[PDB]
Amino acid sequence: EQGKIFIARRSLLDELLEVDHIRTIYHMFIALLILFILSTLVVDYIDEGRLVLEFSLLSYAFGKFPTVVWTWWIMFLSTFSVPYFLFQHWATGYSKSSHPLIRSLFHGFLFMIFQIGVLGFGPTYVVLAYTLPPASRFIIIFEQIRFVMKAHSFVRENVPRVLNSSTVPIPTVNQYLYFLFAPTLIYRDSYPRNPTVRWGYVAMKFAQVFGCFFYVYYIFERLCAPLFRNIKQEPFSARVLVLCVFNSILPGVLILFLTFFAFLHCWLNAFAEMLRFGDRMFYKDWWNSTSYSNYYRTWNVVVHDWLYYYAYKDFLWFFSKRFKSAAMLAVFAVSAVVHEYALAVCLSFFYPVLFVLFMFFGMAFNFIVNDSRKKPIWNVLMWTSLFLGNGVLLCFYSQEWYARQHCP
Amino acid sequence: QGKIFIARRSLLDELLEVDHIRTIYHMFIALLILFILSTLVVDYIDEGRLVLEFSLLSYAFGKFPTVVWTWWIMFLSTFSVPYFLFQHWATGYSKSSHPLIRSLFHGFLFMIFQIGVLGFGPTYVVLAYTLPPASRFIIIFEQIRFVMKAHSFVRENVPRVLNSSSTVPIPTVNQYLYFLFAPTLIYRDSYPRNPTVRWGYVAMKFAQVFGCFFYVYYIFERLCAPLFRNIKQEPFSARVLVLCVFNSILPGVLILFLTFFAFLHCWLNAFAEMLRFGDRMFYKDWWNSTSYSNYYRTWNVVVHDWLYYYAYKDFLWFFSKRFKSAAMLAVFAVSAVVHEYALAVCLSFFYPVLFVLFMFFGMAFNFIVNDSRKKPIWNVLMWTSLFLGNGVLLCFYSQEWYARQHCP
Numbered sequence: 145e146q147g148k149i150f151i152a153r154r155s156l157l158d159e160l161l162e163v164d165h166i167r168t169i170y171h172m173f174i175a176l177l178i179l180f181i182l183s184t185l186v187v188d189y190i191d192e193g194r195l196v197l198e199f200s201l202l203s204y205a206f207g208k209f210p211t212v213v214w215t216w217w218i219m220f221l222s223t224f225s226v227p228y229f230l231f232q233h234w235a236t237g238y239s240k241s242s243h244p245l246i247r248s249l250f251h252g253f254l255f256m257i258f259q260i261g262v263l264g265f266g267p268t269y270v271v272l273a274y275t276l277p278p279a280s281r282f283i284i285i286f287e288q289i290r291f292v293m294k295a296h297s298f299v300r301e302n303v304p305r306v307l308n309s310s311t312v313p314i315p316t317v318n319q320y321l322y323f324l325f326a327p328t329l330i331y332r333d334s335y336p337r338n339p340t341v342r343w344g345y346v347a348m349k350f351a352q353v354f355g356c357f358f359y360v361y362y363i364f365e366r367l368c369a370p371l372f373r374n375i376k377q378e379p380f381s382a383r384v385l386v387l388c389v390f391n392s393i394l395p396g397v398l399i400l401f402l403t404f405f406a407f408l409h410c411w412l413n414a415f416a417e418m419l420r421f422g423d424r425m426f427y428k429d430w431w432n433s434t435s436y437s438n439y440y441r442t443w444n445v446v447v448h449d450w451l452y453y454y455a456y457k458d459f460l461w462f463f464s465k466r467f468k469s470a471a472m473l474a475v476f477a478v479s480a481v482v483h484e485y486a487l488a489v490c491l492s493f494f495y496p497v498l499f500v501l502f503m504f505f506g507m508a509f510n511f512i513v514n515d516s517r518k519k520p521i522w523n524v525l526m527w528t529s530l531f532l533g534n535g536v537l538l539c540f541y542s543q544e545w546y547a548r549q550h551c552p
Numbered sequence: 553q554g555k556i557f558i559a560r561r562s563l564l565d566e567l568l569e570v571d572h573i574r575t576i577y578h579m580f581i582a583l584l585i586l587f588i589l590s591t592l593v594v595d596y597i598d599e600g601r602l603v604l605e606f607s608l609l610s611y612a613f614g615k616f617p618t619v620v621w622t623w624w625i626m627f628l629s630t631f632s633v634p635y636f637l638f639q640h641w642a643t644g645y646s647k648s649s650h651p652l653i654r655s656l657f658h659g660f661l662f663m664i665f666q667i668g669v670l671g672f673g674p675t676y677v678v679l680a681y682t683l684p685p686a687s688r689f690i691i692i693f694e695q696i697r698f699v700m701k702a703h704s705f706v707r708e709n710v711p712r713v714l715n716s717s718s719t720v721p722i723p724t725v726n727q728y729l730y731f732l733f734a735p736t737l738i739y740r741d742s743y744p745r746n747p748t749v750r751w752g753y754v755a756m757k758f759a760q761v762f763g764c765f766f767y768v769y770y771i772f773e774r775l776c777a778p779l780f781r782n783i784k785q786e787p788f789s790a791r792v793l794v795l796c797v798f799n800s801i802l803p804g805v806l807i808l809f810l811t812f813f814a815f816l817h818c819w820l821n822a823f824a825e826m827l828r829f830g831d832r833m834f835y836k837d838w839w840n841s842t843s844y845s846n847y848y849r850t851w852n853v854v855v856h857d858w859l860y861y862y863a864y865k866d867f868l869w870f871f872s873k874r875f876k877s878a879a880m881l882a883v884f885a886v887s888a889v890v891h892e893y894a895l896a897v898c899l900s901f902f903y904p905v906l907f908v909l910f911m912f913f914g915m916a917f918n919f920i921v922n923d924s925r926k927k928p929i930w931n932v933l934m935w936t937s938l939f940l941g942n943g944v945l946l947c948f949y950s951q952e953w954y955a956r957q958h959c960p
């Protein structure tokens with residue numbers, strides 16, 4: 145059925161990481177991580193005498209931080225007040241008069257030019273006018289598309305209900321506040337309260353997400369930054385770009401895994417415990433995923449739920465009755481254009497090919513294991529080609545940005 | 553009392569097809585193939601030719617035609633003369649002039665075998681030519697194999713013929729031969745048959761033993777043989793030994809896990825498949841082991857079966873069970889003197905503290921994780937203490953060899 149429910153709980157990681165063999169693999173994994181840090185620390189301290197621990201990268205990357213705090217505050221206050229009060233005025237006075245669609249067409253036009261103007265251009269103009277550095281710029285573009293999705297969902301959940309006619313009004317402001325911080329993008333007034341907020345648990349989960357952030361940063365500074373200096377000096381057409389595309393693969397895997405674990409698990413469980421959200425199904429077991437059609441297991445639940453429910457369903461509605469291939473390629477086109485936009489205005493670079501070649505690589509990987517081929521040779525081949533293929537297109541994107549798009 | 557077989561399929565066959573652990577295993581293999589591929593094509597571009605040329609391997613094996621003939625002499629000796637002595641003792645029992653005079657002479661002649669032929673023959677031929685430490689390993693391994701199998705083949709049948717009419721059954725040579733190749737150290741005629749030998753399985757297991765041996769050699773040479781040259785040259789002052797113990801960690805646990813997998817799983821299963829042995833109970837889940845006094849889980853069962861069943865049980869019979877733990881200080885001592893024999897003759901170095909400090913470290917790690925503390929903090933601290941603990945004392949052992957035997 146179409147909707148959202150609270151069956152799954154507590155996380156898919158927490159479920160496994162107390163099963164004896166997998167728990168002890170996880171404690172060995174943590175033991176290997178902390179010994180990797182202590183090795184790198186005290187073997188480059190005793191050898192050089194510095195204990196450098198360079199805080200150069202993040203100090204530049206976050207750069208103008210008070211301007212992103214200020215524009216996040218006015219963007220939050222906008223998305224909290226003007227969609228709420230505009231929809232409140234609408235629903236209350238719908239069919240008292242205006243038998244033609246004139247009232248709705250005018251009002252929904254005012255809502256659109258709000259969303260495209262204020263919430264589309266306001267973040268994009270303040271981020272490009274001051275020429276924001278990419279990490280602080282990323283936060284503004286990330287939170288922009290978040291608030292655009294929440295504003296769309298809040299008017300998409302309540303607009304079919306009022307027009308099918310008594311006339312169900314807008315929710316309480318005390319529950320709309322809750323939704324704008326809730327671990328989801330689909331609007332509900334139904335969120336089951338777990339018994340209590342564990343203050344020691346959210347202190348531990350915030351220690352975990354800041355621990356994972358500083359670990360990622362430390363590995364990035366120590367292994368990916370010297371690569372970024374030597375692709376910086378002689379960038380153009382070197383055949384020793386091959387040297388570092390065969391040297392960034394293992395750090396690339398560890399950054400992928402710790403960024404996933406930090407943001408999809410530690411962050412969302414900390415916030416979900418403070419709010420007592422209850423669902424906590426924030427990701428599926430992606431690694432077991434085999435193909436796109438029916439049996440896709442997305443690594444990010446909340447984005448796929450929004451994308452399917454509010455793009456696809458309404459695309460298959462208007463387009464045609466049996467061109468389901470035309471509707472799935474239209475969801476790929478909507479995904480491609482918002483991703484290419486997001487990464488392009490984030491990295492100050494138009495290069496549209498990244499997402500569509502990711503989906504061609506996903507077609508290849510899915511194809512080689514979806515012909516009923518369980519055989520571990522094909523699964524090992526899929527994993528090595530996935531890690532190598534992602535590292536190739538990532539450093540080719542970084543090269544094309546840094547060389548041929550820097551020089552004229 | 554007595555060990556009888558029931559279990560099957562080691563532990564890794566059953567748990568590496570539980571779907572999450574199966575895909576963790578394929579990620580691990582995909583990272584291993586990328587690691588050696590990437591570091592090969594990095595030094596093809598940095599140095600010139602392939603940097604792996606199998607130099608130290610030829611030094612390690614060296615005297616291989618010597619070890620093939622002495623293996624044939626060991627094998628034919630232990631196949632014939634323990635069996636022939638035991639069959640001569642068998643038939644004429646309880647017909648002697650003086651009841652014990654027969655077994656006094658005969659058990660003398662059997663010890664003369666144990667101490668002279670298997671006790672001095674393999675250790676004389678290894679110390680004679682001063683064999684290189686890896687073919688010398690094969691000789692002392694196969695020696696103490698045949699000494700344990702010869703002790704068990706006598707200890708299983710001698711108490712049967714003694715206690716009293718057909719009171720003395722002694723087995724065929726055709727099943728003694730099968731026992732001299734059997735995945736065990738306790739003599740039985742009690743062995744099942746699997747329906748067939750799978751030729752595709754043993755071909756896969758032998759290719760996997762070969763590939764894991766090759767891989768362990770490649771990792772050993774590149775990541776710690778430059779460091780072996782540094783702890784040889786300037787061993788004394790703390791700089792190189794602190795530098796080495798903090799860099800011996802990740803390669804040390806990698807070769808430990810791969811050599812465990814290659815020997816305890818793949819090699820023993822290849823032989824257990826060719827012989828259709830059925831009981832693949834070759835290792836318990838060490839990673840879940842708790843404490844010594846009871847419920848101790850050993851990482852190999854075969855040596856634990858021999859040690860418990862043929863030294864602890866016999867020391868219960870020598871000293872009354874009120875002093876049981878005070879007596880089994882001598883089964884700790886039996887394991888100690890056989891390992892210190894094995895390591896000292898294998899490495900040309902008498903340093904007795906290794907095994908007993910490993911057992912005090914195991915006791916300290918059991919005090920850390922047991923009492924049912926069970927907090928992931930203590931379990932992670934145990935794993936970092938085990939990995940760094942094996943790294944620090946392996947390097948202190950190799951230092952005291954390369955330093956205080958070569959120099960003074």
Ligand SMILES: CCCCCCCC/C=C/CCCCCCCC(=O)SCCNC(=O)CCNC(=O)[C@H](O)C(C)(C)COP(=O)(O)OP(=O)(O)OC[C@H]1O[C@@H](n2cnc3c(N)ncnc32)[C@H](O)[C@@H]1OP(=O)(O)O
Pocket residue numbers: 404430436437438439440442443444447448451452456472475476479502503505506534
């Ligand atoms: C851990 C990272 C790994 C990365 C490694 C790279 C490898 C390559 C992978 C590429 C990742 C790109 C990386 C970007 C990073 C950006 C950062 C972010 O966080 S942004 C997140 C963007 N996330 C996506 O883009 C999701 C991936 N793909 C998608 O966008 C969608 O999930 C999509 C469109 C590909 C899924 O396809 P459907 O919605 O289009 O289409 P359908 O399933 O195929 O067709 C409808 C049929 O499916 C059934 N169906 C679908 N879902 C169902 C459900 N839940 N229950 C029942 N039936 C269902 C329906 O019943 C219908 O079949 P009937 O006609 O009824 O028989």
Ligand SMILES: CCCCCCCC/C=C\CCCCCCCC(=O)SCCNC(=O)CCNC(=O)[C@H](O)C(C)(C)COP(=O)(O)OP(=O)(O)OC[C@H]1O[C@@H](n2cnc3c(N)ncnc32)[C@H](O)[C@@H]1OP(=O)(O)O
Pocket residue numbers: 838844845846847848850851852855856859860864876880883884887891910911913914938942
């Ligand atoms: C992956 C390696 C990582 C290593 C990391 C470092 C840590 C150190 C560890 C290890 C490194 C060694 C490296 C050597 C390498 C060379 C090559 C090889 O393959 S050799 C390997 C084995 N090496 C040994 O040394 C033998 C195992 N070690 C032991 O210490 C023994 O297991 C030992 C001494 C603990 C055996 O037990 P007890 O002699 O303490 O016996 P009691 O305390 O009397 O337990 C018996 C009581 O429990 C009951 N029980 C019942 N079922 C039992 C059972 N299945 N097992 C044991 N006890 C049982 C009995 O009924 C009895 O109870 P009632 O006192 O009479 O009331």
